[PDB]
Amino acid sequence: MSEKKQPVDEDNWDDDNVEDDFSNQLRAELEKHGYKMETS
Amino acid sequence: MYEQLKGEWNRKSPNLSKCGEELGRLKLVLLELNFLPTTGTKLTKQQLILARDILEIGAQWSILRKDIPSFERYMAQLKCYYFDYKEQLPESAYMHQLLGLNLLFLLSQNRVAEFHTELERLPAKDIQTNVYIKHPVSLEQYLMEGSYNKVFLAKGNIPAESYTFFIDILLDTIRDEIAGCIEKAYEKILFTEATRILFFNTPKKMTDYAKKRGWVLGPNNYYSFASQQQKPEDTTIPSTELAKQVIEYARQLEMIV
Amino acid sequence: GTYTLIIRLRHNVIKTGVRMISLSYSRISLADIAQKLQLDSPEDAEFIV
Amino acid sequence: GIISLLDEDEPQLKEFALHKLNAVVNDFWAEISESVDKIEVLYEDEGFRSRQFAALVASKVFYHLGAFEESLNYALGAGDLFNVNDNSEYVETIIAKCIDHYTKQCVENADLPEGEKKPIDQRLEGIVNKMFQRCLDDHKYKQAIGIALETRRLDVFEKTILESNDVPGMLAYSLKLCMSLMQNKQFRNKVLRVLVKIYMNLEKPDFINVCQCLIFLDDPQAVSDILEKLVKEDNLLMAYQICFDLYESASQQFLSSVIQNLRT
Amino acid sequence: DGQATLLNLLLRNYLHYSLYDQAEKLVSKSVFPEQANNNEWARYLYYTGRIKAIQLEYSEARRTMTNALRKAPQHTAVGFKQTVHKLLIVVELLLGE
Numbered sequence: 170m171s172e173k174k175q176p177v178d179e180d181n182w183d184d185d186n187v188e189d190d191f192s193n194q195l196r197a198e199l200e201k202h203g204y205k206m207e208t209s
Numbered sequence: 210m211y212e213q214l215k216g217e218w219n220r221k222s223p224n225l226s227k228c229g230e231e232l233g234r235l236k237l238v239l240l241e242l243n244f245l246p247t248t249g250t251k252l253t254k255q256q257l258i259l260a261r262d263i264l265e266i267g268a269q270w271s272i273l274r275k276d277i278p279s280f281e282r283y284m285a286q287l288k289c290y291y292f293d294y295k296e297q298l299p300e301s302a303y304m305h306q307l308l309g310l311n312l313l314f315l316l317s318q319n320r321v322a323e324f325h326t327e328l329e330r331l332p333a334k335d336i337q338t339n340v341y342i343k344h345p346v347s348l349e350q351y352l353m354e355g356s357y358n359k360v361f362l363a364k365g366n367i368p369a370e371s372y373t374f375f376i377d378i379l380l381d382t383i384r385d386e387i388a389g390c391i392e393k394a395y396e397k398i399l400f401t402e403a404t405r406i407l408f409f410n411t412p413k414k415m416t417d418y419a420k421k422r423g424w425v426l427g428p429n430n431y432y433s434f435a436s437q438q439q440k441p442e443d444t445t446i447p448s449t450e451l452a453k454q455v456i457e458y459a460r461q462l463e464m465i466v
Numbered sequence: 467g468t469y470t471l472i473i474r475l476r477h478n479v480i481k482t483g484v485r486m487i488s489l490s491y492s493r494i495s496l497a498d499i500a501q502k503l504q505l506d507s508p509e510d511a512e513f514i515v
Numbered sequence: 516g517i518i519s520l521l522d523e524d525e526p527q528l529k530e531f532a533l534h535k536l537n538a539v540v541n542d543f544w545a546e547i548s549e550s551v552d553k554i555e556v557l558y559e560d561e562g563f564r565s566r567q568f569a570a571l572v573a574s575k576v577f578y579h580l581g582a583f584e585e586s587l588n589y590a591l592g593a594g595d596l597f598n599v600n601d602n603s604e605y606v607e608t609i610i611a612k613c614i615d616h617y618t619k620q621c622v623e624n625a626d627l628p629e630g631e632k633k634p635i636d637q638r639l640e641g642i643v644n645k646m647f648q649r650c651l652d653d654h655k656y657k658q659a660i661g662i663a664l665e666t667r668r669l670d671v672f673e674k675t676i677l678e679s680n681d682v683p684g685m686l687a688y689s690l691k692l693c694m695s696l697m698q699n700k701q702f703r704n705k706v707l708r709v710l711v712k713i714y715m716n717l718e719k720p721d722f723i724n725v726c727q728c729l730i731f732l733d734d735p736q737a738v739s740d741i742l743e744k745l746v747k748e749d750n751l752l753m754a755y756q757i758c759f760d761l762y763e764s765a766s767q768q769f770l771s772s773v774i775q776n777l778r779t
Numbered sequence: 780d781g782q783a784t785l786l787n788l789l790l791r792n793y794l795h796y797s798l799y800d801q802a803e804k805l806v807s808k809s810v811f812p813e814q815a816n817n818n819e820w821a822r823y824l825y826y827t828g829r830i831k832a833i834q835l836e837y838s839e840a841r842r843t844m845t846n847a848l849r850k851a852p853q854h855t856a857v858g859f860k861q862t863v864h865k866l867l868i869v870v871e872l873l874l875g876e
Contacts, residue, residue, distance in 0.1 A: 173818055173851065175858030176791070232525070239531050244517070245539075282519045289516025292798065322834050328470040329797035329833065335470060346473070353477045355514030358507065390513075471832060471869055478875055485875075545803040581808045 210255060211241065218266055224274050235263065244286075246293045258298065261290055265303060272314075272374055284311050305334075306369050309342040316349050317378035324349065341369045357383070361408070388418050394435035398424075403431060480514060518547045526562040533565060536572040548576055554589070567596050578608055587612045591636045598642065610646060617643055621667045625702060644671065656680040660689050667702070673709055682717075686710075687724060694731070707732050715741060722757040730765045739776035782812035783819050790826045801830045821850035825863050828870075836870040844870065 195201075213234050217227055238244075242256045268283035287307065291297070312327055328335070328346075336343055344363070351360050360383065364376050387407055403424075404415055416426065424431035483503055487494060500511035517535050520528055554573040558566040570593035578586040590597060590609050617640065620633060633639070643666060650659045656678065663672035676686055690710070697703050711728045714721055720741070729738050738761065745754035762770065786809050793800045804810070804827065815823065825847035831840040844867040851860060 171818075171852035171854050173854055173859070174822070176822075177859065177862060178857040236525055236528070239528055243531055243534050245535055278522065282522065285516075285519035289519070292516055325470070326799075326801070326834055327797070329795075332467055332469065335473065350474060350476065353474065354480050356510060357513040358510045468866065468869060471873070475872060478873060482875065543798075545800045546798065548803045549806040550799070550802065579808070580806065 210259075211237075213237070214263065218263075223270075228270075231267070235267070238263075246290070246295065248295075251295060254297075257290075257295075261287070264290075265307060268307065272310075275374065280314075305339060305341050309345055309369075310372075310375075312342070313345045313348075313372060313375045314378075316345060317375050317382065319382070321349075344369070352383075357387070388422065391418070391424055391431075392422060394437075395424075395431070395433055397433070398431040399429045484514065516543050516546060518543075518551050521551060521553050526557075526564065529557055529562070529565045529569075533568045533572065536568070540572060540575060544576060548580065558589075558592075567594050570594075571597050574609070575605075583612050584616075587616060591639055598638070610642065613639060614643060614646070618665055618667060625667045647671070651675065651678055656685070660686065664693070669706055669709055672706065673713065676710075676713065687721060690724060690728075704732055708734070715744075722753070723760060726757050726760050727764070730761070730769065733769070735769060735773040736776045739773060742777065782809045783815035783823075785809075786812070787819055787823050787826055794826065794829060801834055804830060817850060818852070821847060822859060823847075824850070825859065825866075828863075829866060832866060832870055836873050838870075838874055841867070841870055841874070 214231070238256075238260055244260075247253070247256055264283055264286055268280065268287055271280040271283060284307070288311070291304070291308075308327070308330065312324065315324055315327075331339065331342060334342055335346065344367075348360065348363050351363070360379075364379065367376075384407070391403060400411075400415070404411065407414075409415065419426045419431075423434055480503070484499075487499055487502070496511050496515065497508045499515075500506065500508045503511075505511050505514075517532055520532060523529070552573070554569045558569055560566070570589035574586040574590040574593060574597065576586075577583075577589070586609070590613065624632060647659070647662050647666070650662055659675060659678070659680075663675050676682065690707075694703075707728050711725045711732075714725050725741065726738060738757065742754065742757065745757065748754075761773075765773075786804075786807075789800075790804070810827075812820070814820070824843040828840045828844040828847055831837075844863060848860070848863050848867060856864070
């Protein structure tokens with residue numbers, strides 16, 4: 170049994186949802202607001 | 210070498226008295242050798258490369274005369290000939306411009322499941338190379354979303370060949386599509402904006418659409434009958450369907466099966 | 467060899483987009499959604515909508 | 516991939532297109548399986564010299580796809596090209612529909628044979644007795660005693676009493692086995708009344724089967740007819756087991772009904 | 780036993796080919812070989828899943844890709860299970876979920 174002929178060859182999910190909505194966005198906000206106090 | 214044909218094939222003879230002797234000439238191929246893929250005798254190619262050129266030019270002048278049922282005969286002959294695993298020419302100056310031509314008329318056939326059954330025949334020739342087949346799949350990919358203007362930019366920007374009969378179907382099948390998407394909950398549109406969304410300045414083609422559907426011809430006005438009122442408040446239809454499904458819940462609830 | 471299936475995802479990315487913006491915003495200009503979707507053309511941003 | 520040219524309107528590419536429907540009817544058999552089925556167009560068309568082989572290959576392709584009767588009617592109307600080859604795994608595919616359809620219609624023809632009977636297309640019963648001559652001529656008669664019943668026909672089973680197999684007891688024990696597997700009286704009495712008149716026309720007339728069949732059969736005069744043959748032969752030693760098996764097996768109503776035919 | 784292996788062993792290069800043998804697999808009678816031993820049967824639903832992948836998944840075969848995933852044994856994943864873990868939600872990326 171279980172030979173399955175081969176054609177080619179928590180801790181993990183919530184922060185992965187933060188990797189879904191929050192992948193490459195902000196990432197290091199410490200200075201953009203201090204750069205927006207004079208512009209805004 | 211039993212040719213009978215090498216004088217009037219490249220020069221234009223549009224629907225003259227050649228096609229009957231050409232069809233009986235293709236009959237004279239059949240008495241000599243069957244169109245079987247000729248599994249043995251690989252060196253003998255005068256039945257395959259010399260006759261398949263005749264069958265692809267016979268595919269070629271079929272669209273010039275608007276021969277739609279007999280066009281796909283010659284084209285499916287060609288596809289089932291390039292199905293053969295014998296070493297032939299891998300391609301020529303025609304094979305993209307005929308297989309993709311089948312892909313572009315089949316694009317105009319309103320059959321998309323067969324439009325994407327072709328896509329095993331050239332996996333790497335999709336984007337990274339073979340631009341003349343990259344263009345129709347990008348074209349129908351633009352027909353998938355609401356890309357209209359880019360499709361009508363592709364109407365006229367052909368590098369390959371004419372494609373005229375295919376961009377005229379492509380014209381009608383989007384003419385009734387803009388003529389479909391006039392029917393939203395739009396406001397008053399003047400006789401300039403939706404007048405120029407297709408390709409017209411001021412003919413009576415806007416009288417053809419404006420009398421075809423609503424958005425009636427008025428004082429520079431398109432009338433909005435955005436009603437969408439009649440169909441809701443239906444208790445009786447769930448009181449029939451749910452009246453069935455409740456008893457159907459009661460069947461597999463107490464009665465042994 | 468999934469590439470011919472990958473190539474058609476732009477339609478569902480843009481339906482994801484119009485569901486996202488139509489779900490988020492309520493009174494949004496057509497002359498904003500093409501720029502936020504970097505469509506570079508409002509004249510068919512009427513047409514995707 | 517030979518399929519696209521079925522609108523040539525020049526009737527020898529139909530023939531040259533059915534050139535490749537028997538040798539390479541494995542690889543693109545899956546191709547021409549459901550998409551194009553224009554066999555009946557040229558089969559009903561005025562264009563002859565095909566409609567013969569075209570029904571063969573639809574009898575090939577519709578068989579494996581479960582259209583057994585679609586392969587069976589084209590198996591009937593295909594003609595001489597269809598039954599010419601029996602050197603494959605295909606005759607067992609077609610007579611398991613054809614002779615099965617034959618006997619399952621001949622049960623209804625055993626109900627009402629007169630009126631609204633079968634329009635046989637001259638082969639649906641032709642390969643019945645043709646393959647039955649294969650059964651009679653391939654040395655096996657313990658089964659050729661069988662197809663003569665399974666065809667639900669009387670005179671072919673009356674025919675096979677004289678064959679290449681002799682009669683020591685063969686067919687006499689066939690009634691010993693068929694009385695046990697006997698379904699009803701309707702099919703029983705018709706065969707039983709016609710076997711036991713050739714049992715009297717046999718060289719040595721058997722008596723226990725012709726008394727047993729007749730108390731099974733309710734003929735209160737024929738055992739008085741052959742009883743008149745045994746008074747005519749004048750030996751009460753062989754007019755004995757025809758008679759005390761008749762008293763032992765028959766009842767007061769049958770012995771009280773045959774007595775008028777014995778005393779007269 | 781002749782209805783089962785003779786159809787994936789029929790399919791395995793037809794998927795790598797471009798012949799019409801997808802609609803023949805639609806109209807085929809051998810689509811059910813009746814409990815094909817959990818190994819050819821489990822992969823068979825995947826092999827017919829990629830059929831409607833190349834012929835335009837309309838959320839029909841996501842349950843047969845999912846079923847093709849869930850009927851697997853316990854050996855390794857790199858041969859087929861990494862490709863049903865990819866292609867199984869290729870076709871849902873085509874949906875929107």
